Write the structure tokens for this entry.
Amino acid sequence: YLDLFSHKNMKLKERVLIPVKQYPKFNFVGKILGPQGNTIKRLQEETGAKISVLGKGSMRDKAKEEELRKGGDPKYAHLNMDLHVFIEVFGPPCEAYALMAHAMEEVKKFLVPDM
Amino acid sequence: YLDLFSHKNMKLKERVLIPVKQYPKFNFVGKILGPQGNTIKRLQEETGAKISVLGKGSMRDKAKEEELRKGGDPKYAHLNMDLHVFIEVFGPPCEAYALMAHAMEEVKKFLVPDM
């Protein structure tokens, strides 16, 4: 049950696949991160969500990715996953849902680019 | 992972406690259902969510509730739960979140009545 008087926050997280199969040559990573990373910075500030691009291809630097993968460090474990956008929000229940809804709608604009 | 090209719908459900402890004498059931059930009908139409009041006290008819409880029918199993609002939505991921966010915000108006 959600108790609206609880002091617990709700967390919501989603991993939204980047649809590389539907758009095999579209540069989603460059488009979402933006020059210098200012598109995704702005996307986070605008949505109030934590949003990251994870999975293989997310660094657009095959060589770097391979070196970090092979190091074994757990913080680079995501480099083996399918490319995706990882959205994380927290808050009181009503607010967490509003944050996630908004983040999901703005991210979908990037991921279905011919819509 | 959510695949935005999947034909699967997402379902979201929440059980939001009616805060009887914070407002021991407030008639939440009458207020949410409304005369004839037109408040909750309208609430569903406005939000696009399935919304029901469940749990003990939800029928405001102690006698009826006891008779239906003691019958053993699984569809009345909820009558033993704490009074709550059960919100259910379905749809493509972005839409399901938007539906749940909206439903949660309108329901919270009913459940924190001195806000």
Remarks:
- Residues 10-111 of chain A form a domain with the Ribosomal Protein S8; Chain: A, domain 1 fold (CATH 3.30.1370.10).
